[PDB]
Amino acid sequence: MGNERLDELRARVDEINLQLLKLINERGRLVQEIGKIKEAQGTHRYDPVRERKMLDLISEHNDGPFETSTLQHIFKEIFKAALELQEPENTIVEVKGERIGDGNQYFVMGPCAVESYEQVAAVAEAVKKQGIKLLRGGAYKPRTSPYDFQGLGVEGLKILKRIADEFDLAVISEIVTPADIEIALDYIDVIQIGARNMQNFELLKAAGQVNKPILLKRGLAATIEEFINAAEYIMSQGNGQIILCERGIRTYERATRNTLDISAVPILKKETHLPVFVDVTHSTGRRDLLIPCAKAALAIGADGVMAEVHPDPAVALSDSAQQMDIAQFNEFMEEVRAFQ
C-alpha cells in the first residue's frame, strides 16, 4: 500500500540533486579556465573581495526557506572547492601471499611491543604453528604516561625483518613520523598508523607516497566520516593499499578500556571497499573478552582480527594485563578455528 506522495517527492529531490551536480561541475570548468588566466598573470588564486561580492548576490531577495547565513555557508563550501580545484568492487592487499579482503578472513598476531629478538622469536614460532602469516610488533609505541616505553625504534625494525625472513612471515609495525616511513620500507611489510595519529596528516601524506600496504587505525574519538576522510587522503596521494582497523572508541563506560564498535565494520566495508580489521585487544582491553569479540568480529564479516600475544605478559613492557600468553593464544585459536 505505501506512500505514493513521499516517493514522488523524493524522486523530485533526486532529480534536483542531479541538476545541481551538473551545474556545480560546469561551474567547475569555468573555474578551471579562470585559474589558468589568473595564474598566467601571476595573481593570487583566492579573492575574498570577489567572494563577498558573489555572496551579496546570493543574499539579495532571499524568500526561499533558508536563512541567508545558511545559504552563504553552502555557497562558501562551493567556492572552497573551486579554489582547491585550482593547482566499484573490493580492494585486495597482497602481503606475502595473503590476499586480504579476498573474502577470506585473516589474523594478525604478535606482541604489543618489540622488546628483544628472543621475545619476538618465541611468539613467531607459536603463531606460525597456528598457521598465521601476519605478525605484528611495536617498533615504535605511542606513549601516554611518563614511565611508558617508547620503542626500540630501528633496532626494532631490524629485529622484525630478521624474524620475517627467518620464519617466512609478513611483519607489521607502527611508524610514527614521516621521516621513518622511508626507512621502514626495507624492514617491514605493512605500515601501521596508530589511532593517535589518524589525523597526523604529515604522516598520512608520507604513507600515501610509498608502495606499501598501510594499516590505518581509527582515532580514539573519530567519526566514521573522519576516518574515511583520513583514508581518502592516503589514496588521493597514490597509495590505495589500505587496511582499516576498528579498535574501539572512547565512551563513558569504565568496564571496558574502550567501547568496541562493531557497527563500524559493515559500514566501512560498504562505504569504502577497503578491507577492515578489528583489534580485539585494544578495544576491550580485557583478556576475558578477546575470544567473544573475535567471533563477533568474524561473524559480522570483518576481513580479519588482530590481537596481541607475548610469552610472559605479566612482565611485558606494555599491555601487561591485555596480552595473551602462548597458552592463552592457543586456546584462543582453537576456539575461533572452531568458527569453522
Ligand X SMILES: O=C(O)C(=O)C[C@]1(C(=O)O)C=C[C@@H](O)C=C1
Least Å distance between CB 44 and ligand X?
8
Residue 73 marked ligand-binding:
no
Choose among ligand X, Mn ion, a copy of itself, none what residue 186 binds, the Cβ cut-off being 5 to 8 Å by kind.
none
Please identify, among the stretches 30-38, 60-68, 107-115, 156-164, the one whose residues bind Mn ion according to the rule CB under 5 A. Answer: 107-115
**Whose Cβ is closer to a copy of itself: residue 50's or residue 129's?**
50
CA 291, chain centre distance (Å)? 23
Regarding 319 and contact with Mn ion (CB under 5 A), the answer is yes
- The span from the CA of 336 to the CA of 281, in Å, is 15
> Going residue by residue from 36 to 55, which x/- string records binding to ligand X, judged by CB under 6 A?
---------xxx--xx----
The torsion defined by the Cα of 16, 19, 25 and 29, in degrees rounded to 10, comes to -150
Measure the CA–CA gap between 60 and 102, rounded to whole angstroms: 55
Residue nearest to ligand X (CB): 82
Q: CB–CB of 296/270 below 8 Å? A: no
CA distances from 238 to 210, 234, 288 (A): 8, 7, 40
- How far apart, in Å, are the Cα atoms of 241 and each of 200, 207, 277, 303? 18, 10, 14, 14
Q: Which is nearer to a copy of itself, 135 or 297 (CB)?
A: 297
Can you spell out the DSSP letters for 188-202? -SEEEE-GGGTT-HH
60 assigned binding-site residue:
no
Q: How many CB atoms lie within 10 A of CB 295?
A: 16
Closer Cβ to ligand X, 33 or 202, answer by number:
33
Answer whether 302's CB lies under 8 Å from 106's CB: no
Is residue 325 a known part of a binding site? no
Restricting to residues 52-81, name those near ligand X by CB under 6 A.
79
Cell representation of residue 270: 560498504
Alpha-carbon span 85 to 200, nearest angstrom = 23
Smallest gap, in angstroms, from Cβ of residue 227 to a copy of itself?
Answer: 10
Q: How far is the CB of 103 from a copy of itself (least distance, A)?
A: 15
112 binds, among ligand X, Mn ion, a copy of itself, none (CB under 5 to 8 A by kind): Mn ion
Torsion of Cα atoms, 48 then 50 then 55 then 57, to 10°: 160
Binds 90, which of ligand X, Mn ion, a copy of itself, none (CB < 5 to 8 A, cut-off by type)?
none
For residues 6 to 35, the per-residue mask of contacts with ligand X, x marking binding by CB under 6 A and - elsewhere, is: ----x--x-----------------x--x-
**Residue span binding Mn ion (CB under 5 A) among the ranges 23-31, 106-114, 228-236, 253-261:** 106-114
Q: Which residues bind Mn ion (CB under 5 A)?
A: 112, 319
Binding-site residue numbers for Mn(2+) are 112, 282, 308, 319
Residues that bind ligand X (CB under 6 A): 10, 13, 31, 34, 45-47, 50-51, 79, 82-83
